[PDB]
Design an enzyme around this catalytic site. Structure first.
Site, short mmCIF file in Angstrom:
data_model
loop_
_atom_site.label_atom_id
_atom_site.label_comp_id
_atom_site.label_asym_id
_atom_site.label_seq_id
_atom_site.Cartn_x
_atom_site.Cartn_y
_atom_site.Cartn_z
N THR A 1 34.85 2.74 49.51
CA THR A 1 36.40 2.96 50.59
C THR A 1 35.84 3.62 51.74
O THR A 1 34.39 4.22 52.35
CB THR A 1 36.76 4.37 49.79
OG1 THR A 1 37.33 3.83 48.61
CG2 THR A 1 38.06 3.88 50.57
C1 LIG Z 1 35.20 2.94 48.04
C2 LIG Z 1 35.02 1.93 47.07
C3 LIG Z 1 33.44 3.97 47.64
O1 LIG Z 1 33.76 4.04 45.88
C4 LIG Z 1 36.56 3.82 47.39
O2 LIG Z 1 36.01 5.17 47.38
C5 LIG Z 1 37.11 3.58 46.11
C6 LIG Z 1 38.78 3.70 45.87
C7 LIG Z 1 39.42 3.36 46.13
C8 LIG Z 1 40.85 3.78 46.48
C9 LIG Z 1 41.91 3.46 45.11
C10 LIG Z 1 41.80 2.42 44.52
C11 LIG Z 1 40.79 1.74 44.59
C12 LIG Z 1 39.75 1.93 44.89
N1 LIG Z 1 36.62 4.04 45.03
C13 LIG Z 1 36.43 3.37 43.47
O3 LIG Z 1 36.51 1.98 43.82
C14 LIG Z 1 36.06 3.63 42.38
C15 LIG Z 1 34.47 4.55 42.84
C16 LIG Z 1 34.31 5.31 42.01
C17 LIG Z 1 34.16 5.06 41.03
C18 LIG Z 1 34.24 6.98 40.10
C19 LIG Z 1 33.85 8.24 40.55
O4 LIG Z 1 33.58 9.00 39.51
C20 LIG Z 1 33.14 9.93 40.57
C21 LIG Z 1 34.29 8.17 41.82
C22 LIG Z 1 34.43 7.45 43.26
N2 LIG Z 1 35.57 3.54 41.64
C23 LIG Z 1 36.26 3.40 40.57
O5 LIG Z 1 37.30 4.52 40.47
C24 LIG Z 1 36.21 2.34 39.31
C25 LIG Z 1 37.24 1.13 39.79
N3 LIG Z 1 36.83 2.57 38.27
C26 LIG Z 1 35.93 3.24 37.27
O6 LIG Z 1 34.13 3.35 37.63
C27 LIG Z 1 35.85 3.68 36.41
N4 LIG Z 1 34.67 5.15 36.22
C28 LIG Z 1 35.85 6.61 36.82
C29 LIG Z 1 35.43 7.75 36.66
O7 LIG Z 1 35.82 7.75 34.99
C30 LIG Z 1 34.93 7.07 34.34
C31 LIG Z 1 35.16 5.69 34.32
#
Ligand SMILES: *[C@@](C)(CO)[C@](*)(O)[C@H](Cc1ccccc1)NC(=O)[C@H](Cc1ccc(OC)cc1)NC(=O)[C@H](C)NC(=O)CN1CCOCC1
Ligand SMILES: *[C@@](C)(CO)[C@](*)(O)[C@H](Cc1ccccc1)NC(=O)[C@H](Cc1ccc(OC)cc1)NC(=O)[C@H](C)NC(=O)CN1CCOCC1
Ligand SMILES: *[C@@](C)(CO)[C@](*)(O)[C@H](Cc1ccccc1)NC(=O)[C@H](Cc1ccc(OC)cc1)NC(=O)[C@H](C)NC(=O)CN1CCOCC1
Ligand SMILES: *[C@@](C)(CO)[C@](*)(O)[C@H](Cc1ccccc1)NC(=O)[C@H](Cc1ccc(OC)cc1)NC(=O)[C@H](C)NC(=O)CN1CCOCC1
Ligand SMILES: [Mg+2]
Ligand SMILES: [Mg+2]
Ligand SMILES: [Mg+2]
Ligand SMILES: [Mg+2]
Lengths: 204, 212, 222, 222, 196, 233, 195, 195, 196
Positions: free
Chosen positions: B1
């Protein structure tokens, strides 16, 4: 702190009808930070082309090392090194550093000037030769490249068609990898002409 | 993000990218990171996708219940504080959120509240949140004035996301623009970075680092 | 990997699958795990791919020099001794698991070597991730006084067990037959039971599909 | 220490057309380097023209599908047999998944069906409940192999109109069910080649206004 | 492993099972754990297959070179060479070796060398994982100056029990008889020893 | 959170034309110590189901009690307890599968791998697996532990897919199972020679065979093997 | 250490480097010059591990000066950068590696062109129009992407550089006590005293 | 958070608190007011863990305001400080303790005396002529030991405070973006706008 | 510990050493590891002294309450109560208990309960650290329907060997004879058993 995925990058090589193609992205980063969009990963020593992914300092070091070794080869042998022989030289050199390796994913590509046969080969960081009829992949988006190449590739493609296939393989693989992209270069290699094309791709 | 929102003469601009990542794997390029809570209320998403997605739509349910009970649209301050008090209850449990509650009300005027998962809640004129926040700040700060026109402010917000989308590996996809006025929020389109970058490069003459 | 070795009437046969993996990814779909140490001494290798190739070449090189020095055909026990002493010296860090086999003036032989430098003797052996699938077949069907054609069948059947049941093994079956008094015959891709089916569609692109920024001729000449 | 999670491998794929939607998945089930079953379906008809798959850890996958199937049942009881729309199903699943935010279901979930305008719909979830409607999504072990191919062939990414100097993009258009199934079959055969956990068989569930149809195809068993 | 060596009237007999394990998988069910370091000096190997093998090979080399210069070595000398290797490399070795040999002057002799690299001369010795289960039995049943047939039965019954209880032991019971007469190899299959 | 103490090794099974066969050795291992030799690891439920269990024996005995109690509970206020409303294999499995997954979800698992073999009321063969993680799957051949690595390859040569089931007789199927048990005795360090075998047929019903032994073993070739390389004597 | 920037313009290379030396909770010095002149038309700025930085800079300086005396000739910026990279590329696999990142700004007198090289402690070399090491890049790169043009003058480059320092002074957590700016061009190296 | 100071003089208590809110490598805000008015003649500044600080400050504020309404009476600074200490003393043995350090400046209207209390997150209370939390104390205490006198005016106290901020701005590693200064005296609480 | 219980013609006999250790120090050399949970139901305790003690006390309480309501409990019932405690609290217990009792209908019975909390009904049982050294001996020497004197000799010789090899075992050999005749306590001192 995983050496092979600090800088990022990809290389792919393919064979066609009486030709070979080798392509790479242009990104060099430091983890999330993109630093350079001009970092080419493909080099050549005579008619033998070498693409190297992985830790960028080793990419540079190995290029300089193989230029060194192929220059001495040519002086002593009085001929250009061939792809099959160069592949063996790369393997030897990588295995020499068995317990302190260069964190790289090299890819040899070229046409044997005597037989005319298209030749490609891949290696792991430690020297294991991976020879292939069809394609070799390397880098942080190797999974993506494997999936693209395995579906898109067909044998005996003409140079102009092969260009489209390898370019689409690289571009769409690069766009699913955060650490790859930021520009791309494709080398089309025929028996006695080599065309280099820079691709237009998304810059994120 | 990379997400931002800034206050100015003509209200509030809100701009976000659309990339989702799972490590170095690009999971999505078409994600909605702005949630329309109500016609006068927006919420931006950064951090864990679900944590933001789940709790900000829940926030929308709480804001709806407020206006049913109180016969009046919730204030931006009260809305942001519902979310901040919620995440504070989960402090330490491992929620990951960097959000911005943007909106206009009569008593407050245009207002932006930064709310994150360790309980921080800040009122402010300019915020950039996400892995590419620093890249957005660089462009936004160096071109920001209060007296920007609606046209120029929209572009600066769009250009700041593009800047981050380009440099930050974990930002990209497309830019989603929003403009918040006294009359409510207005959507100003989805802008694919694939085309937007070259269009901006050519017209603006910027991005000379890139092979043209 | 899956690799086997089977002794028979007048010699020994070894076989191997042709899959190379990187985690869950198939790196090479048709790699050669059968290695020539000397003309009539061959090696099947499992474990770290580079290590099996490198250690087999080094000992193969030294065996050739030894053969020239002594004016004799090399013996399997010499390769066995040189391999195990090399592997022991590296305390398992060279991850080569080998099935060594061949014919020499002493007779026909079959051994296995582990990464730490221990050797076994046997009439039938199997190493690699699919060794349990292979050994299950070997234990079920092996008998004393096998013929050449029976041993090849048993060996390739043991490799097939690995190919189908082990995820670390796949693609094709390589075989090498070493018979006494005859030349060793290397049967590359002896079986190919994993041919890719015709694709549903050709993904040949219309020419011009890819957007291009620059073109230039590359100079490969002097 | 006891590890409550495992990885049962496999991969799944959902594509949406104009008046239809497909949800495909291989029938292989694995642990480590062993095959548990060559035919263990993980794509399920859940009623109300909603097909679902939860790929990853099969115990969690089955648990989730079981709970959602039950959720559909009680939706009928509580709301006068009203049809559960795909968008409502998606939101309901988010709450199922997030309910275990701090002890997650280790699965990439995909559902497919038709929206309330009759148009094809695919929704995809992360393990903890974040969801998004898309034209296209691959999930599971070989998601990284298949997904970039889908971007290129379904959404025509990186494909420009020939001769337009890379200025005009290839226009988006809906694919026929015949064309989509071709892409699904090619995606899985390609994935089977290069991923060890993918193979054995392919089961596709097609969803139109007329109902849910099935198609099965053999995959390589190595 | 279960291994043992037993002195008797005419000389000494070595005994061993034939099981080699990598975890709970049996890598080799017909292993030969009784190895020749000299004509009438043999050893039983327990612990790491690779370590004991590398040691036995070095010892065999040392005793071959000893014989070239000074004639037949004593069993004590052979045990001393084993000790020297095991003691000086104790940090890098997992080897429990029993050394057994026949002299004409000293008759049958048994030396056991545990993990530390210490040397212990005994009337009989037991070693390996399966030896734990037969300390009770062997102590109660061993007698000095047994006959060949009695010693063979003693080893057979002992290793039979060791094999029965130890999962790391099994297969065939190999034996090697060392007397003035020469060297005799014996083998005993499950169908015989299991029902003792 | 547990660690298994007294353990049982492989349980192997397969479908044939009219029913299912399941087998498991009679050993209760205590680490490397082969402690208990009279342990029955196949437990019949009614006259149409056999539950084979590997892993922790204390947990196996707990599961025995649950199944025993399930039979009692099913008989309550049930005039058709020995007829239409008798316990099916599918009911018994789903109950266990539910328990296994609930226990793993409470971080206190029953440390077992379980195979429920039986024949349904309509004549259909039932064969399904469940383990400590609550992971379930079905296949023409199923095996646990070392059986999964060694037995399955052999049993799949007989029944490689669904269409091979009608073509497989009870004689051929039992022969493969008995062969697999021998191979496991050669190669599994925590297996015993003694085992039990159960056949559930849709015509002849439940046949429970106790005190079977592995036989026709090849050991003779061992006498020819000398040293580990160069040794000639 | 911490902030080192570099901008190559039409006719010169401009290096900006922070003046602060911090150790613990104390700013020990606010006038530190994090640069060494390698040759009359080659300047190297540096940042990284305490001690390593100056030790490495001066070691390179000595070697280049030795070369100059031996051949009575100035090495090209490209040649100097390649020498420096190789020294770091050796270092990274040593018992104790130099943890030093450098920027090399030089004017090639044979080509009449300014050149800027960015080299990290791993020995990763890149020629750039503008460069930065550490966290500085996370703000400046996006800013320069926008405002930088290849045909700028030295005065335009300094104004562009002021914009970077202002952004860093606004958003960076630490007080780096301003920067020392130096210009490398056809006439050699000179320092801007009022910045 | 980070820098909070307090100086009790003859007739007033002066609280200075840094304006910066930093998170990662970004200063998110440079105008933050790290204080809450508990009652008309009692002010509390705070510093510590993100979220905890404001949550704790406002929780105390609500309780003191509740007391004021219930009794129609203002609690003495001493009484407020004792209440606050007990809340932190409870907190430290909770499942998740408040990681907040506070200064309580108040004017006791019954005694006609200014009072300054320093309370850390453990619940360690001390009345002081001058106080500080965090690393600030390591510079300011020795400075105030020297320059502070008990009979100073509010204007003298502000000049003494300027001396502290100048020292911190010179030697502290981080940019804390200046301070918001507030004075507590017989007439209540007021903010100095030009500092 | 070394402990064992052996069924025979007239009933069952329990046997145990008397050594309690805290490391290599012997905290008690005259321990009574044979404990009464009911008139003619006894148990041998191995593992944690505190755990086995707390369990035996709870069982004795349960069986006393059982007797008040339903009369004399079976040996199987006693073993079931032991199991219930050991199994349900397996995470917090280190107890290896042998349960032995005499009914008039069922005669002598022996149930062993290892660490996991499983129940195993056997003709005879051995347990404790010193049992490892006598698996070989006990298997070879045990016969069903032995006499009292034979069973006493079997236990005495067995525990004598267990004590000889196990450092964690020693002191006196206590025994408890359970028959229709009643309950008889036996003791055997080092000077007797050591020289067997
Ligand atoms: C940018 C892309 C950097 O990551 C943004 O922060 C983005 C924000 C966002 C908000 C709303 C909808 C889409 C995207 N964040 C992500 O895409 C995020 C990155 C992230 C992963 C894990 C985290 O935990 C510490 C924190 C941030 N990605 C995700 O959430 C992905 C889609 N899902 C996973 O990785 C599944 N994980 C999440 C945590 O729990 C275990 C499973
Ligand atoms: C089967 C496939 C094991 O899955 C075989 O053992 C096979 C043996 C083989 C392959 C080709 C030619 C000759 C012999 N082994 C592999 O394919 C091997 C599997 C493996 C991966 C990693 C390991 O780490 C300890 C050990 C075994 N794959 C490779 O060697 C690949 C080509 N290289 C790497 O993964 C690079 N590794 C090597 C070890 O050092 C770290 C980097
Ligand atoms: C019985 C089986 C168990 O102790 C014997 O001691 C037996 C002795 C033997 C076997 C074959 C030939 C001669 C003598 N030992 C083994 O079978 C041995 C078990 C063992 C392995 C490692 C040890 O510590 C280093 C100790 C005992 N098996 C092996 O050596 C096998 C062939 N290799 C492995 O298990 C691989 N090991 C290598 C060492 O590091 C751990 C992995
Ligand atoms: C032999 C000696 C060794 O196993 C027996 O099992 C014996 C049984 C016994 C002793 C007295 C009365 C009835 C039965 N066990 C012990 O002597 C026992 C050894 C032991 C201690 C702790 C264990 O794990 C928890 C397992 C075995 N000794 C004791 O319990 C002594 C009195 N206490 C300690 O050693 C103190 N322990 C308490 C548990 O935590 C470690 C420190
Ligand atoms: Mg980017
Ligand atoms: Mg396979
Ligand atoms: Mg306890
Ligand atoms: Mg003792």
């Amino acid at each position: 702190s995983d050496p092979s995925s600090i800088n990022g990058g990809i290389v792919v090589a393919m064979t066609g009808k009486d030709c070979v193609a080798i392509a790479c992205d242009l990104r060099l980063g430091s983890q999330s930070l993109g630093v350079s969009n001009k970092f080419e990963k493909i080099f050549h020593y005579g008619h033998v082309f070498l693409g190297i992914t992985g830790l960028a300092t080793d990419v540079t070091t190995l290029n300089e090392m193989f230029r060194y070794k192929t220059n001495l080869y040519k002086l002593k042998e009085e001929r250009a090194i061939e792809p099959e022989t160069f592949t063996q030289l790369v393997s030897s050199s990588l295995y020499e550093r068995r317990f302190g390796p260069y964190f790289v994913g090299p890819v040899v590509a070229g046409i044997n000037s005597k037989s005319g046969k298209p030749f490609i080969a891949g290696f792991d960081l430690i020297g294991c030769i991976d020879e292939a009829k069809d394609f070799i992949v390397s880098g942080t988006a190797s999974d993506q490249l494997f999936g693209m190449c395995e579906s898109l590739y067909e044998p005996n493609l003409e140079p102009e068609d092969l260009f489209e296939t390898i370019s689409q393989a690289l571009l769409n693989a690069a766009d699913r990898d955060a650490l790859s992209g930021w520009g791309a270069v494709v080398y089309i290699i025929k028996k006695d002409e080599v065309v280099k094309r820079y691709l237009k791709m998304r810059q994120d | 993000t990379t997400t931002l929102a800034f206050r100015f003469q003509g209200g509030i601009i809100v701009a976000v990218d659309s990339r989702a990542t799972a490590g170095n794997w690009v999971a999505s390029q078409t994600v909605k990171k702005v949630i329309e809570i109500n016609p006068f209320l927006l919420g931006t998403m950064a951090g864990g996708t679900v944590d933001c997605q789940f709790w900000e739509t829940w926030l929308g349910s709480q804001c709806r219940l407020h206006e049913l009970r109180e016969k009046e649209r919730i204030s931006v301050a009260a809305a942001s504080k519902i979310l901040s008090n919620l995440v504070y209850q989960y402090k330490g449990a491992g929620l990951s959120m960097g959000t911005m509650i943007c909106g206009y009300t009569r008593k407050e005027g245009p207002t932006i509240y930064y709310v994150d998962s360790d309980g921080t809640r800040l009122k402010g004129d300019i915020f950039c949140v996400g892995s590419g926040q620093t890249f957005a700040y660089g462009v936004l700060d160096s071109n920001y004035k209060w007296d920007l026109s609606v046209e120029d402010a929209l572009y600066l917000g769009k250009r700041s996301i593009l800047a981050a989308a380009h440099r930050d590996a974990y930002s990209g996809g497309s830019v989603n623009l929003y403009h918040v006025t006294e009359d409510g929020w207005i959507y100003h389109g989805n802008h694919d970075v694939g085309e937007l970058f070259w269009k901006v490069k050519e017209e603006e003459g910027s991005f000379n680092n890139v092979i043209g | 990997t899956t690799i086997v070795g089977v002794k028979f009437n007048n010699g020994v046969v070894i076989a191997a699958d042709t899959r190379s993996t990187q985690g869950p990814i198939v790196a090479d779909k048709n790699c050669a795990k059968l290695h020539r140490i000397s003309p009539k001494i061959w090696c099947a290798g499992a474990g770290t791919a580079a290590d099996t190739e490198a250690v087999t070449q080094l000992i193969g090189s030294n065996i050739e020099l030894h053969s020239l020095y002594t004016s004799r055909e090399p013996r399997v026990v010499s390769a066995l001794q040189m391999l195990k002493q090399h592997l022991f010296k590296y305390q398992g860090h060279i991850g080569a698991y080998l099935i060594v086999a061949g014919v020499d003036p002493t007779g026909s032989h079959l051994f296995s070597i582990h990464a730490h430098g221990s050797t076994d003797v046997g009439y039938y052996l199997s190493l690699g991730s699919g060794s349990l699938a292979a050994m299950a077949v070997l234990e079920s069907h092996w008998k004393q006084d096998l013929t050449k054609e029976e041993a090849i069948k048993l060996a390739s059947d043991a490799i097939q067990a690995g190919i189908w049941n082990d995820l670390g093994s796949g693609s094709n079956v390589d075989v090498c037959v070493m018979e006494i008094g005859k030349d060793a015959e290397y049967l590359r891709n002896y079986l190919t039971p994993n041919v890719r089916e015709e694709k549903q569609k050709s993904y040949k692109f219309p020419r011009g599909t890819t957007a291009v920024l620059k073109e230039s001729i590359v100079n490969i000449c002097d | 220490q006891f590890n409550p999670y495992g990885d049962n491998g496999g991969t799944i794929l959902g594509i949406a057309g104009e008046d239809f939607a497909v949800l495909a998945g291989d029938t292989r089930n694995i642990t480590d380097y062993s095959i548990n079953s060559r035919y263990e379906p993980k794509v399920f008809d859940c009623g109300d023209n909603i097909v679902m798959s939860a790929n990853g850890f099969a115990a969690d996958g089955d648990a989730l599908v079981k709970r959602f199937k039950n959720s559909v049942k009680w939706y009928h009881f509580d709301h006068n047999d009203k049809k559960l729309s795909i968008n409502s199903a998606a939101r309901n699943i988010q709450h199922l998944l997030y309910g275990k935010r701090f002890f997650p279901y280790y699965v990439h979930t995909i559902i497919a069906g038709l929206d309330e305008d009759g148009k094809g719909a695919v929704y995809s979830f992360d393990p903890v409940g974040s969801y998004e409607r898309e034209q296209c999504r691959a999930g599971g072990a070989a998601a990284s192999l298949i997904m970039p191919f889908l971007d290129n062939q379904v959404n025509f990414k990186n494909q420009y109109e020939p001769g337009t100097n890379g200025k005009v993009k290839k226009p988006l258009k809906y694919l026929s069910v015949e064309e989509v199934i071709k892409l699904v079959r090619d995606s899985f055969t390609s994935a089977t080649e290069r991923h060890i956990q993918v193979g054995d068989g392919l089961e596709i569930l097609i969803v139109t206004k007329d109902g849910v149809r099935k198609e099965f195809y053999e995959l390589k068993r190595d | 492993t279960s291994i043992m060596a037993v002195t008797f009237k005419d000389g000494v007999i070595l005994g061993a099972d034939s099981r080699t394990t990598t975890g709970a998988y049996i890598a080799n069910r017909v292993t030969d754990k009784l190895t020749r370091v000299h004509d009438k000096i043999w050893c039983c190997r327990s612990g790491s297959a690779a370590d004991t093998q590398a040691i036995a090979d070095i010892v065999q080399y040392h005793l071959e070179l000893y014989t070239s210069q000074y004639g037949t070595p004593s069993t004590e000398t052979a045990a001393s060479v084993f000790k020297e290797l095991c003691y000086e490399n104790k940090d890098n070795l997992t080897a429990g070796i029993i050394v057994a040999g026949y002299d004409d002057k000293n008759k049958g002799e048994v030396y056991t060398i545990p993990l530390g690299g210490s040397v212990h001369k005994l009337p009989y010795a037991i070693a390996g994982s399966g030896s734990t289960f037969i300390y009770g039995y062997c102590d109660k049943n061993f007698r000095e100056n047994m006959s060949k047939e009695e010693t063979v039965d003693f080893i057979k019954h002992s290793l039979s029990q060791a094999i029965k209880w130890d999962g790391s032991s099994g297969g065939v019971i190999r034996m090697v008889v060392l007397t003035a007469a020469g060297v005799e190899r014996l083998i005993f299959y499950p169908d015989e020893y299991e029902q003792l | 959170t547990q660690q298994p103490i007294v353990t049982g090794t492989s349980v192997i099974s397969m479908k044939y034309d009219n029913g299912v066969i399941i087998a498991a050795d009679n050993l209760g291992s205590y680490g490397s110590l082969l402690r208990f030799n009279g342990v029955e690891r196949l437990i019949p439920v009614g006259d149409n189901t056999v539950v084979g269990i590997s892993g922790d024996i204390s947990d196996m005995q707990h599961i025995e009690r649950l199944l025993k109690d399930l039979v009692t509970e099913n008989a309550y206020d049930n005039p058709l307890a020995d007829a239409e409303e008798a316990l099916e294999p599918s009911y018994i499995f789903e109950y266990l599968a539910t328990v296994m997954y609930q226990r793993r979800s409470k971080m206190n698992p029953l440390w077992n791998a379980i195979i429920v073999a039986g024949v349904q009321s309509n004549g259909d063969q039932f064969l399904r697996y469940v383990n400590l993680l609550g992971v379930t799957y079905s296949s023409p051949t199923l095996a646990t532990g070392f059986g999964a690595h060694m037995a399955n390859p052999l049993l799949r040569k007989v029944v490689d897919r669904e269409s091979d089931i009608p073509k497989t007789t009870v004689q051929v199927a039992e022969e493969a199972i008995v062969n697999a048990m021998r191979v496991l005795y050669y190669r599994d360090a925590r297996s015993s020679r003694n085992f039990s075998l159960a056949i559930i047929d849709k015509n002849t019903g439940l046949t429970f065979k106790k005190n079977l032994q592995v036989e026709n073993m090849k050991w003779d070739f061992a006498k020819d093997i000398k040293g580990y390389g160069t040794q000639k004597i | 250490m911490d902030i080192i920037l570099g901008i190559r313009v039409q006719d010169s290379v401009i290096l900006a480097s922070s003046k602060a030396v911090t150790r613990g909770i104390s700013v020990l010095k606010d006038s530190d010059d994090k640069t060494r002149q390698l040759s009359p038309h080659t300047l190297m700025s540096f940042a990284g591990e305490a001690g390593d930085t100056v030790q490495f800079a001066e070691y390179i300086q000595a070697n280049i000066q030795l070369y100059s005396i031996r051949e009575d000739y100035e090495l090209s910026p490209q040649a100097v950068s390649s020498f420096v990279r190789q020294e770091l590329a050796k270092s990274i696999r040593s018992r104790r590696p130099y943890q030093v990142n450098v920027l090399i700004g030089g004017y090639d007198k044979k080509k009449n062109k300014p050149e800027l090289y960015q080299i990290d402690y791993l020995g990763t070399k890149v020629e750039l129009p503008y460069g930065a090491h550490g966290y500085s890049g996370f703000y400046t790169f996006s800013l320069l992407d926008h405002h930088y043009r290849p045909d700028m003058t030295t005065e335009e480059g300094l104004d562009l550089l002021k914009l970077c320092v202002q952004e860093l002074e606004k958003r960076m957590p630490m007080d780096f006590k301003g920067v020392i700016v130096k210009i490398v061009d056809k006439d050699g190296i000179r320092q801007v005293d009022d910045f």
